[PDB]
Design a protein around this ligand. Sequence first.
Ligand SMILES: COc1ccc(CCc2nc3cc(-c4c(C)noc4C)ccc3n2C[C@H](C)N2CCOCC2)cc1Cl
Ligand SMILES: Cc1cc(N2CCOCC2)cc2[nH]c(-c3c(NC[C@@H](O)c4cccc(Cl)c4)cc[nH]c3=O)nc12
Length: 116
Amino acid sequence: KKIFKPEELRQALMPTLEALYRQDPESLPFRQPVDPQLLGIPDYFDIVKNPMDLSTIKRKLDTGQYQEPWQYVDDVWLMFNNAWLYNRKTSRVYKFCSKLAEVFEQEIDPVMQSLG
Ligand SMILES: COc1ccc(CCc2nc3cc(-c4c(C)noc4C)ccc3n2C[C@H](C)N2CCOCC2)cc1Cl
Ligand SMILES: Cc1cc(N2CCOCC2)cc2[nH]c(-c3c(NC[C@@H](O)c4cccc(Cl)c4)cc[nH]c3=O)nc12
């Protein structure tokens, strides 16, 4: 299998993570982990078995926790799939998620090609 230095993944992928963060207000619900107590939604962790958010992805990328770049792609799509699963299609959060996913799909393709 192919070997990737943590520093190579960090430098290559950080611009794509910035592209998500800079979407305002769409990234705001995704910048920190969903807090079901604060939001009053105790069933969140029953429906969403594997929570994910931008802060967790950013920490994994900054600290060298990904073995290969498709694991970062996996985490980003997990984040988006969790939001589309939990929230109504008509809801703000679902629509914000769809904006972020549109940004991500545009940005991630050339980066993954260059990482080989
Ligand atoms: C700016 O955008 C919003 C602002 C408020 C709401 C309703 C309340 C809220 N409703 C939220 C819903 C989610 C969420 C996600 C993401 N997936 O399932 C759920 C539920 C996550 C966070 C949510 N939050 C917290 C939001 C983002 N605040 C954080 C601190 O500063 C002000 C805004 C929704 C949105 Cl989309
Ligand atoms: C593009 C796209 C759109 C939507 N929309 C939802 C509703 O609104 C309209 C469409 C949902 C998606 N779900 C996923 C998805 C993954 N994609 C990989 C892709 O990024 C990718 C694939 C090959 C190479 C590269 Cl470089 C990147 C991977 C794992 N699990 C996933 O669910 N992709 C979706």
